[PDB]
């Protein structure tokens, strides 16, 4: 089963439902939102316009019930987010955690996993 999106930063994100646990290990959306708040400065800085959608793809993956796997954003989306947001993170130096290392996300039209792009 699925649950409506309750994380404030993932409202009006493109899809309506999610399933716990997410891809970050959290087992409810409350605890998911609290650890998502660590990246709130980067969403606000807008170094990439799709960073909020990419992050929500992992902290609140899409759920429809038919599809049996949580669905993240494409590899294509994450690389651009870490590329274009790296300069400002370099300044503060806290680097993209391996929790978010882009090479875990499936490429678009990848043999074993499905992905999403942003509206």
């Amino acid at each position, epitope marked *: 089963k699925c649950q409506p999106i309750e994380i404030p930063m993932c409202k009006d994100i493109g899809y309506q439902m999610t399933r716990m646990p997410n891809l970050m290990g959290h087992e409810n959306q409350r605890e998911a939102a609290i650890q998502l708040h660590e990246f*709130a400065p980067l969403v606000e800085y807008g170094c990439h316009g799709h960073l909020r959608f990419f992050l929500c793809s992992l902290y609140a993956p899409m759920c429809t019930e038919q599809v049996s796997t949580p669905i993240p954003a494409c590899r294509v989306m994450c690389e651009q987010a870490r590329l274009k947001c790296s300069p400002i993170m370099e300044q503060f130096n806290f680097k993209w955690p391996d929790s978010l290392d882009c090479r875990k996300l499936p490429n678009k039209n990848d043999p074993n996993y499905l992905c999403m792009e942003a509206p």
Partner: antibody, heavy 120, light 102 residues
């Protein structure tokens, strides 16, 4: 609904210390972004210090870095601004304010301020 | 520093400029402050009108410049206006105090 009330203002001599209180009602202090913004009389607003919610990411302005320190105590649901080695330049009305995150990213609620006077 | 002054009449169109750098995000807020009161939020994210703010208020970013425009200045609008930067500067610009021509 959201409301912030400042306390702890008053008079202090140069080099002295003061601690302001920012009492929150309507939202939890823990996991919330609070900013301190001061206004010297007849002058403009000056952002001073801020938390982004978690213990880290506490930021200060250069004019106060080293001398001012942010705290909180979730039981009382109030944040604190410890001010040390005060100079007369720090004479100002001190505001605390909640920074609404997504989708605002703005100080949507302010206290009424408390006056801090540093003088001999 | 001290706020800049601008003299205007009711019904005038005013555009206040907040000069920054292009290395700053568009999470810029605009505030309105009247004597002896706390600032009030007008515009967030450079262009989004806050709730209960009249439609004659407007925000836009162009390069390094953020602007506030009042399309038809009304008597309640004469006050001081401040822009604020987003993370990680959070710095306020110089205020613009709009006073009424008489």
């Amino acid at each position: 609904e959201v409301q912030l009330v400042e306390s702890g203002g008053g008079l202090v001599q140069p080099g002295g210390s003061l601690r302001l209180s920012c009492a929150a009602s309507g939202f939890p202090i823990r996991g919330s972004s609070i900013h301190w913004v001061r206004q010297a009389p007849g002058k403009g607003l000056e952002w001073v210090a801020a938390t982004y919610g978690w213990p880290g990411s506490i930021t200060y302005a250069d004019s106060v870095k080293g001398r001012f320190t942010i705290s909180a105590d979730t039981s009382k649901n109030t944040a604190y601004l410890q001010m040390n080695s005060l100079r007369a330049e720090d004479t100002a009305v001190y505001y605390c304010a909640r920074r609404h995150t997504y989708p605002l990213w703005a100080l949507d609620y302010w206290g009424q301020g408390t006056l801090v006077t540093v003088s001999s | 520093q001290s706020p800049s002054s601008l003299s205007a009449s009711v019904g005038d169109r005013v555009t206040i400029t907040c000069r920054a750098s292009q290395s700053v995000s568009s999470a810029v807020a605009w505030y309105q402050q009247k004597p002896g009161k706390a600032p009030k939020l007008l515009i967030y994210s450079a262009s989004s009108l806050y709730s209960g703010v009249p439609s004659r208020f407007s925000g836009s970013r162009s390069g390094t410049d953020f602007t506030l425009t009042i399309s038809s200045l009304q008597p309640e609008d004469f006050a001081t206006y401040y822009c604020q930067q987003g993370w990680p500067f959070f710095t306020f610009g110089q205020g613009t105090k709009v006073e009424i021509k008489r």
